[PDB]
Design a protein around this nucleic acid. Structure first.
Ligand SMILES: [Mg+2]
Ligand SMILES: [Mg+2]
Ligand SMILES: [Mg+2]
Ligand SMILES: [Mg+2]
Ligand SMILES: [Mg+2]
Ligand SMILES: [Mg+2]
Ligand SMILES: [Mg+2]
Ligand SMILES: [Mg+2]
Ligand SMILES: [Mg+2]
Ligand SMILES: [Mg+2]
Ligand SMILES: [Mg+2]
Ligand SMILES: [Mg+2]
Ligand SMILES: [Mg+2]
Ligand SMILES: [Mg+2]
Ligand SMILES: [Mg+2]
Ligand SMILES: [Mg+2]
Ligand SMILES: [Mg+2]
Ligand SMILES: [Mg+2]
Ligand SMILES: [Mg+2]
Ligand SMILES: [Mg+2]
Ligand SMILES: [Mg+2]
Ligand SMILES: [Mg+2]
Ligand SMILES: [Mg+2]
Ligand SMILES: [Mg+2]
Ligand SMILES: [Mg+2]
Ligand SMILES: [Mg+2]
Ligand SMILES: [Mg+2]
Ligand SMILES: [Mg+2]
Ligand SMILES: [Mg+2]
Ligand SMILES: [Mg+2]
Ligand SMILES: [Mg+2]
Ligand SMILES: [Mg+2]
Ligand SMILES: [Mg+2]
Ligand SMILES: [Mg+2]
Ligand SMILES: [Mg+2]
Ligand SMILES: [Mg+2]
Ligand SMILES: [Mg+2]
Ligand SMILES: [Mg+2]
Ligand SMILES: [Mg+2]
Ligand SMILES: [Mg+2]
Ligand SMILES: [Mg+2]
Ligand SMILES: [Mg+2]
Ligand SMILES: [Mg+2]
Ligand SMILES: [Mg+2]
Ligand SMILES: [Mg+2]
Ligand SMILES: [Mg+2]
Ligand SMILES: [Mg+2]
Ligand SMILES: [Mg+2]
Ligand SMILES: [Mg+2]
Ligand SMILES: [Mg+2]
Ligand SMILES: [Mg+2]
Ligand SMILES: [Mg+2]
Ligand SMILES: [Mg+2]
Ligand SMILES: [Mg+2]
Ligand SMILES: [Mg+2]
Ligand SMILES: [Mg+2]
Ligand SMILES: [Mg+2]
Ligand SMILES: [Mg+2]
Ligand SMILES: [Mg+2]
Ligand SMILES: [Mg+2]
Ligand SMILES: [Mg+2]
Ligand SMILES: [Mg+2]
Ligand SMILES: [Zn+2]
Lengths: 91, 98
RNA sequence: GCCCCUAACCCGGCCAUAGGCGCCGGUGCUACACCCGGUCUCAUCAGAACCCGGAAGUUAAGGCCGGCGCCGCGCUCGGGAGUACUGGGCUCCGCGAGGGCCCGGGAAACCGGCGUGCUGGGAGGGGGC
RNA sequence: GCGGGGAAAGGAAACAUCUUAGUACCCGCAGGAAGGGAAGCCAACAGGGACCCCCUGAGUAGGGGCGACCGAAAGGGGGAUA
RNA sequence: CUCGGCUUAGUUUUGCCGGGGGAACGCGCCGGCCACUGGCCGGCAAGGCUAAGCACGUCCCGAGUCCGAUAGCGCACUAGUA
RNA sequence: CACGGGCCGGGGAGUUCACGGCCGUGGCGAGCCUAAGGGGUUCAACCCCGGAGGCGUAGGGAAACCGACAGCCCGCAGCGGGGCAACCCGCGAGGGGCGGGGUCUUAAAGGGCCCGUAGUCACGGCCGUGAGACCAGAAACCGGGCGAUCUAGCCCUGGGCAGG
RNA sequence: AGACCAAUCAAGCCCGGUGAUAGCUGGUUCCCCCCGAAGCGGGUCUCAGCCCGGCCUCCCCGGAGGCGGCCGGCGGGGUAGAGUACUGAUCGGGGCCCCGGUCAAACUCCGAACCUGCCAGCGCCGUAGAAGGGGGGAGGCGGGGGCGGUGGGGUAAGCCUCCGCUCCGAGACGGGAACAACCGAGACCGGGGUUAAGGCCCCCAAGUGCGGGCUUAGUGU
RNA sequence: UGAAUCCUGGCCACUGGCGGUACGUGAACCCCGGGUACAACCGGGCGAAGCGCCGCUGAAGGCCGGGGGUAACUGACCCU
RNA sequence: UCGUUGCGGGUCCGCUUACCCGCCGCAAGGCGGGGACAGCGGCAGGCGGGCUGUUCGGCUGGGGCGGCACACCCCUGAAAAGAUAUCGGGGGUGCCCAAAGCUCGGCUCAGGCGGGUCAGAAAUCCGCCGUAGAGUGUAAGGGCAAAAGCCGGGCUGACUGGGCCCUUGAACGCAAGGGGCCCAGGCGGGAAACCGGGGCCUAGAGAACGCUCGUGCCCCCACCAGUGGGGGCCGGGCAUGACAGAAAAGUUACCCUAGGAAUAACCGGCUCGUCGCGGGUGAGAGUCCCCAUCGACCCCGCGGUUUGGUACCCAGACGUCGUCUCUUCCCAUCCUGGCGGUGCAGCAGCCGCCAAGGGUGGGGCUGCCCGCCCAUUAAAGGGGAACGUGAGAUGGGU
């Protein structure tokens, strides 16, 4: 499905409708100082089996389309999902 | 296979209309101003099915408790449980038995 | 200002007894139309339509009313028919699938007959308070 | 009693991290007890004042397929007091 | 300080062992739940001892809503015997 | 024609602790109880002391932080009035509802939790969880020790195999 | 040859961890009295287990209504049947239409019996306590028989899987020749009487009972 | 593999082993840059074996079909 | 790769004392060679069933293979309230669409007919008819005609913060998801009414921990303040399809434990599709002539003599094929007795009826049963008895 690169959308910070640029959400890189990550390094030290489950069977074919909308006035970012479907083409 | 339970899962005969009742339905049911305390019959209109109550409430009698914008809040029972139906007047009729 | 009666007009309710085909009429001061033009508001390829301004003509058509035939339709009417089917009981029949009896309910098609919009509010018109 | 080496069964309704458990068991070394013991402490700007053991703090903080389960310390009350 | 490992409630923060690196000096050094900076507070590691108050039961003494010879310790007896 | 028992005697199975819920009673009551321990005793009993601590009295929120009722209505019992009575009337603890308040979220409204009193200590009972956990029952797995008089293999050193 | 390693070997033996665990199997000890189930729904590495509801029992609060039956008023439905008009199948006659004919779990103009919602009443239950609510303890979560839905499936099955009443499980007793659930019927103890189902020639209590007709096959009882 | 005797055919695609120029990838260490009054942290570089890639090996484990038709079953034909 | 690892010289060369290897010697020490390499310790990558621990789901007309009836949706089953199962029947789902979403307005669709240059069955044009016979993304069912369809104009409500209700989940506990009615903020369409929190309706759906992103003049981090960093509350996402969510391959005939008739194999029970046997019919054959002898197409039965279906009993156990031995029973009769028919001249043969007293044998082949064959014979029938009979045998097969 095709999506426009800019929309007119309500802004909670501005309390009105402003132009929003449309981009694809990209997940951040996992940082080594995250608390769960630090715990996972502590578990990984020493002898033993693999200490955590790793998924081997997957069933989802597509991920939910997560898009990022940025207000052109203040910079407020809204992240909305369009539902599980193939990757949109920003147009 | 066990019964599927969609919101309208055995509604072929319920939602069907005879040939003489085809098309738009009359607007007289929109013009009944129900108060709190009056008795109404839940009679589902197949042409406005998006706002209709479930098939289990067809033919049942409730008590108008109030209005929510344009819908009527109706108190009814299913066997022993007290249910709250919020439907527009197009799926209602006045009860003339008491 | 008020109560009463009353066409065609406006707003409805039920949405064919209201629909469809054909035939024979009535209606014209007012009202409804057809009708006459496109300066203005408004519109399209097109003043056909929509919108605007009007009043020479016409009941030819639409509308409304009356009658007849056909199709369709409606009926709490007669026959079909207490039939088909059915709730309850049975040490009642049948090899059996099934059927019978008693108590209680009870159609449909079809055939014949009848009917072919009814009605609410307002305008206009008449009467009286 | 002190130091070191060190499981599994079972539990988690499977099982590997985990628990069981620093346990069973093994090796070494003492005493009538052992070990600990005299602030490079705890606290919070108010003060405690070596140590051990008992009651409590407390299944609290926290650890943990944050699951099962595991789990203090300071402080307070005592025995005794060097 | 860093890497590996065992352990600990110790969690970017317990203790330790191993490999590698590696101070300062009382004008110094250490601690105050991640690190550093400033203040403030508390202290002086890497040397040794220490009674009392606490565990145990071969053994001795006393007690018992304990058992009473198939019970109670395996053994009431020429039982750790045949 | 499912399995167990030849017979008789004796033996033979819901225990205890900790924690939690609840019940039946008892004490005290906006408070309740002491733990360890201490003194005395006719000496594990008993009397006295010991309030540390635990639970309750206030909740909301992740946290910083903030921190609460007698107003109204319905109404059982009960009470008072009437009535021959039936019943009617008024007040009405407890109960129900509404309102008001404390706090969180929100821009707000709305919404969540809480608020106008009862706890606590004990004894007996039931149940849950752990502990062996009503009694009996594996095949297994791990730790430390024992075994090559048997047997498998090999090494050192002896004996044996008529007759054709 | 997975042979043998002290009657032990697809990994010895002894003692210990250890009373290992066991949703599985066996056993589980005195009397009387009151009430009295279930094998259904959902979830679960769930299908021989367990949890949340339904069904049981006990206690308490609550306070006047309740509903396995019936009549009526006002409503809902789309089955049996019916039809062949929508969607389809299907045989003939006549000129894409008309007429007659055969069908439909996944066709429907019509349409019961019946079931179900509210109200009023009758009936019964209820202040010796309806509705509603709280607390404890469960069992049980394998069901089965008869009848009815031509239930749906299957050649059929004492077959598989649903729906409802009743009965057995957990219910004595009479009849059925025996026989959990077929008919009658619901049992504190003793006695007397009368009946139910069914029976009355003997076995066996009660009739070689009554009228009419049929059967010659010991058909049948 | 299993006396002796006559013999032991084609195939390295796969599973292995082994050898190899370059190149890609490839851990720690180390180095560079950023960040941090210091660290944690973040980006990059270098880059062993091995893997990828290239060969050799069947008395290594072994494998050994077809499609067809043409052809006067096919000697022969195209090969695929 | 870090250390061992040293001494000279210009990363490379050399040296010996380290270290290592052998020889001699009780040792002391000497000889030779290698040499800061090697070897050794730590760390890191690779190969690594050599060894250690484990997992190898469920439903199921027994298990297995298959299927997914394992999470969902529509029609039917379903018995006119509600609910309702089977490895029941017909199908679909894990999407797609910036327009196929919102609103406003105009129009009318399939198809048919008449007229019209190219032009035609079908293009664009004029008119008449046209109940939807079209279209509405996608299964099925439902809805829809000045529309819910087609065309055009203007937009992004597929919106921010919240509440209530319905369904999933009947009465009656209980996720996620989905739908409805609203309050506030700010918009779009429209004259307004009114509508818009995706698709006309019923499917397209995912807990805890962890990570990531957005958001707040936001809260916390241990004596105080600051910097970096970390944690928290609210919301979107990354996934468990076995879809109320473990991270998981075989084999055992060498096998072991606990149970189970909740569940198969043998026998038994029920059933009889299959198997064997009987009957009705008579097209047709039989020189003519249905029925001497048959018997198409069809139909009604019986037995329990094959095979299956079911899973009622039996897993602390009913000894699994055949044969030998021995006894009895049935008749649906192969011979022997009686009778009839004939397409019965005789000899023979074929068919039916009564009849179970007696007989029904000897060999070759195969573990067989069965079947075929050989020479005879009056003929060399077939079945039941826990597929009679293993506390009688045998042991060829399995
Ligand atoms: Mg269900
Ligand atoms: Mg919608
Ligand atoms: Mg144990
Ligand atoms: Mg386990
Ligand atoms: Mg296990
Ligand atoms: Mg000694
Ligand atoms: Mg001492
Ligand atoms: Mg000492
Ligand atoms: Mg521990
Ligand atoms: Mg004695
Ligand atoms: Mg003794
Ligand atoms: Mg048994
Ligand atoms: Mg016995
Ligand atoms: Mg337990
Ligand atoms: Mg194990
Ligand atoms: Mg061992
Ligand atoms: Mg020997
Ligand atoms: Mg073998
Ligand atoms: Mg042996
Ligand atoms: Mg072994
Ligand atoms: Mg042992
Ligand atoms: Mg009773
Ligand atoms: Mg059992
Ligand atoms: Mg009624
Ligand atoms: Mg029918
Ligand atoms: Mg019919
Ligand atoms: Mg019904
Ligand atoms: Mg069951
Ligand atoms: Mg039944
Ligand atoms: Mg039972
Ligand atoms: Mg009897
Ligand atoms: Mg008698
Ligand atoms: Mg007879
Ligand atoms: Mg070869
Ligand atoms: Mg070296
Ligand atoms: Mg090395
Ligand atoms: Mg292995
Ligand atoms: Mg699995
Ligand atoms: Mg299974
Ligand atoms: Mg399968
Ligand atoms: Mg229904
Ligand atoms: Mg429209
Ligand atoms: Mg569900
Ligand atoms: Mg329910
Ligand atoms: Mg759709
Ligand atoms: Mg869904
Ligand atoms: Mg502090
Ligand atoms: Mg599930
Ligand atoms: Mg069975
Ligand atoms: Mg059998
Ligand atoms: Mg047959
Ligand atoms: Mg014949
Ligand atoms: Mg059979
Ligand atoms: Mg039996
Ligand atoms: Mg037996
Ligand atoms: Mg036996
Ligand atoms: Mg005969
Ligand atoms: Mg047998
Ligand atoms: Mg036999
Ligand atoms: Mg035998
Ligand atoms: Mg025998
Ligand atoms: Mg043999
Ligand atoms: Zn903005």
């Amino acid at each position: 499905m095709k999506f426009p690169k800019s929309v007119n959308m309500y802004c909670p910070r501005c309390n009105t409708y402003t132009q929003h640029s449309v981009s694809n959400y990209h997940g951040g890189q996992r940082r080594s100082l995250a608390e769960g990550q630090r715990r996972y390094e502590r578990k990984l030290k020493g002898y033993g089996s693999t200490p955590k489950p790793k998924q081997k069977r997957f069933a989802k074919v597509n991920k939910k389309v997560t898009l990022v909308f940025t207000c052109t006035k203040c910079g407020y970012k809204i992240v909305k999902s369009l539902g599980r479907m193939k990757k949109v083409e920003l147009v | 296979v066990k019964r599927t339970h969609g919101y309208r899962y055995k509604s072929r005969k319920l939602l069907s209309k005879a040939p003489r009742e085809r098309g738009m339905s009359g607007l007289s049911r929109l013009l009944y101003e129900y108060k709190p305390g009056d008795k109404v019959v839940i009679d589902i209109d197949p042409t406005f099915i998006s706002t209709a109550p479930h098939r289990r409430y067809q033919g049942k009698v409730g008590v108008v408790i109030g209005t929510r914008g344009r819908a009527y809040v109706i108190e009814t029972y299913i066997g022993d449980k007290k249910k709250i139906i919020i439907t527009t007047p197009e799926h209602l009729r006045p009860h003339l038995g008491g």
